[PDB]
Amino acid sequence: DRLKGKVAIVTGGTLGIGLAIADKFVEEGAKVVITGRHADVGEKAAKSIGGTDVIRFVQHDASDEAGWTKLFDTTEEAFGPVTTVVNNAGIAVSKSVEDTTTEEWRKLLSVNLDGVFFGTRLGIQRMKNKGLGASIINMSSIEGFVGDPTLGAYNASKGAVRIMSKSAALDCALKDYDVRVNTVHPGYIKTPLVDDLEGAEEMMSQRTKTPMGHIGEPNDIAWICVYLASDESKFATGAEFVVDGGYTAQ
Amino acid sequence: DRLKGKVAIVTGGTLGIGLAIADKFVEEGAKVVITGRHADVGEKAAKSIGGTDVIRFVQHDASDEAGWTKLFDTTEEAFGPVTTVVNNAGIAVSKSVEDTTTEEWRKLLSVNLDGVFFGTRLGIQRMKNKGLGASIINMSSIEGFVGDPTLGAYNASKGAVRIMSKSAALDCALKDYDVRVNTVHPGYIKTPLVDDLEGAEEMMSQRTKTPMGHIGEPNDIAWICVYLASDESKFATGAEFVVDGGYTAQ
Amino acid sequence: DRLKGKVAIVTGGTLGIGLAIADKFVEEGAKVVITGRHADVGEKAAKSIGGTDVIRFVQHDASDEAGWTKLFDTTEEAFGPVTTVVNNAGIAVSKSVEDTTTEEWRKLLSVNLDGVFFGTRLGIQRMKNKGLGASIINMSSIEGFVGDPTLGAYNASKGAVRIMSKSAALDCALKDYDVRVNTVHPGYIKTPLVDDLEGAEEMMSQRTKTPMGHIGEPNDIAWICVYLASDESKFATGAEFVVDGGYTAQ
Amino acid sequence: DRLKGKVAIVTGGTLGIGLAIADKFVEEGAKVVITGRHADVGEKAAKSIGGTDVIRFVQHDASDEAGWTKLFDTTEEAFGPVTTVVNNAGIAVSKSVEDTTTEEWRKLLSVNLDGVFFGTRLGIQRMKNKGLGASIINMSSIEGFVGDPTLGAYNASKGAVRIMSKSAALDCALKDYDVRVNTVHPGYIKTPLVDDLEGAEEMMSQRTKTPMGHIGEPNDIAWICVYLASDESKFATGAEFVVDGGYTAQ
Ligand SMILES: [Cl-]
Ligand SMILES: [Cl-]
Ligand SMILES: [Cl-]
Ligand SMILES: [Cl-]
Ligand SMILES: [Mg+2]
Ligand SMILES: [Mg+2]
Ligand SMILES: [Mg+2]
Ligand SMILES: [Mg+2]
Ligand SMILES: [Mg+2]
Ligand SMILES: [Mg+2]
Secondary structure (H helix, E strand, C coil), rough: CCCCCCCEECCCCCCHHHHHHHHHHHHHCEEEEEEEEEEEEEEEEHHHCCCCCEEEEEECCHHHHEEEHHHHHHHHHCCCCCCEEEEECCCCCCCCCCCCCHHHHHHHHHHHHHHHHHHHHHHHHHHHHCCCCCEEEEECCCCHCCCCCHHHHHHHHHHHHHHHHHHHEEEEEEHCCCEEEEEECCCCCHHHHHHHCCCCCHHHCCCCCCCCCCCCCCCHHHHHHCCCCHHHHCCCCCCCEEECCHHCCC | CCCCCCEEEEEECCCCHHHHHHHHHHCCCCCCEEEEEHHHHHHHHHHHHHHCEEEEEECCCCHHHHHHHHHHHHHHHHCCCCCCCEECCCCCCCCCCCCCHHHHHHHHHHHHHHHHHHHHHHHHHHCCCCCCEEEEEEEHHHCCCCCCCCCHHHHHHHHHHHHHHHHHHHHHCCCCCCCCEEEEEEEEEHHHHHHHHCHHHHHHHHHCCCCCCCCCCHHHHHHHHHHHHHHHHCCCCCEEEECCCCCHHH | CCCCCCCCEEEECCCCCHHHHHHHHHHHCEEEEEECCCCCHHHHHHHHHHCCCCCCEEECCCHHHHHHHHHHHHHHHHHCCCEEECCCCCCCCCCCCCCCHHHHHHHHHHHHHHHHHHHHHHHHHHHCCCCCCEEEEEEHHHHHHCCCCCCCHHHHHHHHHHHHHHHHHHHHCCCCEEEEEEEECCCCCCCHHHHHHHCCHHHHHHCCCCCCCCEEEEEHHHHHHHHCCCCHHHCCCCCEEECCCCHHHC | CCCCCCCCEEECCCCCCHHHHHHHHHHCEEEEEEECHHHHHHHHHHHCCCCCCCCCECCCCCCCCHHHHHHHHHHHHHHHHEEEEEEEEEEEECCCCCCCCCHHHHHHHHHHHHHHHHHHHHHHHHHHCCCCCCCEEEEECCCHHCCCCCHHHHHHHHHHHHHHHHHHHHHHHHHCCCEEEEEEEEEEECHHHHHCCHHHHHHHHHHCCCCCCECCCCHHHHHHHHHHCCHHHCCCCCCCEECCCCCCCC
């Protein structure tokens, strides 16, 4: 089991990429708490992966600072000290910078930027200096590297996550905290939400978007996260891991 | 005059880098409005560069959304349609991610991230489709490329500016708006604020920080901004311009 | 076994990083041919990992174009069609650009650049369109991202490998070849050759070099290569994977 | 005159980008030697810009190491000590990595990589420690950042130039040589050679290639080179300057 003894929080773990991360984490021996906004979805998601000795759902919005405190306490009460934080919760807005309302701007940043900050800050505090082989995996995207004219606020958030994570990685390394911090950068990934938008997958699969001519699947992101959570990656910190079908290579 | 006919807003234009940008912009034939928080400083700054036929001060906090509207109106009433926006206002917090309070986080992002968003969004709206050769110059820094363990929130802000700017550049290019958007990335620059912090310049001048073994001066940033504001750079958009003494090259 | 059915060529596989890659590849079910310059070293290396049903040594200099042809034939005769090429062979020269002789320049590029080209070109030709889940892993380094004043020719070679690999990745993706191409970028890795240079590890472990305050081990590079060789990484192509203790994050 | 007192060598200065660099350098007060392969073209090019008190042609192939020595001597005899080297000579091959012959590979690298090495190495040696405000401008391209499946060897060369230049920049900075080294990265630029290839400009102008929906002109590259040659850029070293119509921003 590649994640023997690990205890992970996966935010936005009830759908899509986060769900697959949780699934493979459990497969590799981790205990996992998944978060999401909705109880129906979250309880189904947890039980689809395993019983409560290995996976539990907690309703939590990543923008909710006070709830973060409680989430660590709930997770540690269930499974012992947290070792691994996957800051995956996120939302999207389909607006150019020009067309973004300030309400849209603040709402997207409250999840995609504040939530990652809250989980990273608290993860460092609660995991440092415990010999846990701790790992914080911050979910950026291809939009942390390149612009998309239709994703202005999203681009801001993903670029912020990219560089903030390097700061945290460095501080943890220099202080010998036994905490690593890295970013994962998915390209386009097939999910029910993509399937719900007519034409989206075909748009994303054009060669001028994804050179492989198709989009990825959630397990593509799960497997790089297993590597990063595991002690196999004990010398990797402050780095970006891109799984994008070639999107950013052209 | 390399900026003949240009009309620029330079936020945080009363001190340091912004002041030098304003100075060289006026030298190259632009009309300039500089903003800053404090009237004493701002009125002295404007008159040190020129008379009110070429430069004026407006008291404005870049985090103040409603004031942005008014700032464009004031500038256009003085000098005619704005052509050039330099989003330079910024603040700093000397805290690791771990140690950043949420108040510090939100306050820094309100200037360094929201202010750049507000000026970029409004600049696109008010400059597009006017044949102005319009240019938005967003001030990132070396901390938009690399982490600094002591500058967590600052890193978040500068990474956000870096990538958000690419989104805006692309939208403007694809829609033929005649608006370019680029980022400038200073390394360490000698200013009175650096001089006020005992030991700072020597720290910044170590070869492991700045390979040139000294730090820069405000005109180093002014001259790259003249290039970017001018029609000389009409094919440059979505790009990062690094003036850092080699900091990021190692 | 994470590399079930894979058949790998690991150049420079008799020492250091390459040896560890070969070791973990065999552990994960691959068949492996390792190359190196010297028979004594190579035969000991192969037998330290396994018997000839899983690993064999072939004496080969990666700069030797004609030998590449033969190497694929030898490997396929032993183990069946090659699926995985790790272009790891390399040499180093400790000279600034200013001080590099043309002989040094050409010799280093013949291994570090031509060898990677030869293995990549031939790997595409011999692995495309066979449903192998083929993967070409080109060993760049931190010196593919940042300069080192003492490693001028080495920097040239590693930057060339970095970007050439993206070209190959794209061509393979666009043509549906079922071949991925990625680069791995080690930071400093403890080996007998580092141990032989008095003071080297301490130099490399300074916080201004490696923020973790120590250097890595060969298995750190082996494990990212297992991920990249395996079908777990089927959506990763054209990307750079950095395992450097934080070197490039500051 | 922004280049008062400068003495520049511009390789491949008889056509296209190099010709425009030479033209604007002379306009800004520099003395210039342009090189090229062909006397007819070179003598016409020089006289189109000015008389022999400001510009001269020397027939030289950048791959010719012995000729480099002589080129500096010729230039210094004409105009005094060289201050500025623009390594612009280059060739292209339209082949994937898979399809590149070794002859094509070596020939392209002899100009695009060896020529830049020869000019950089010799420029450092002959310009260091003379108080000249010396500047080496190495012409990379967008193909130093991103792959193109049809430009495998070209990608290798441009990535090598990109990173080798950082090594040189650092060495010069650390040793206080008064020599800066930077790379320029053109996107697509309209020239007679592009005009000669039916359909090329339209291909390059598609929004999925160049977001501005058109390609650039040689003066777009000349003006960034004026900035980099001038003392305005005295704090810029080891950096990449991208003028690409947005190509790399998406
Ligand atoms: Cl979903
Ligand atoms: Cl100041
Ligand atoms: Cl060794
Ligand atoms: Cl031409
Ligand atoms: Mg319908
Ligand atoms: Mg004191
Ligand atoms: Mg001794
Ligand atoms: Mg660095
Ligand atoms: Mg025809
Ligand atoms: Mg791209």
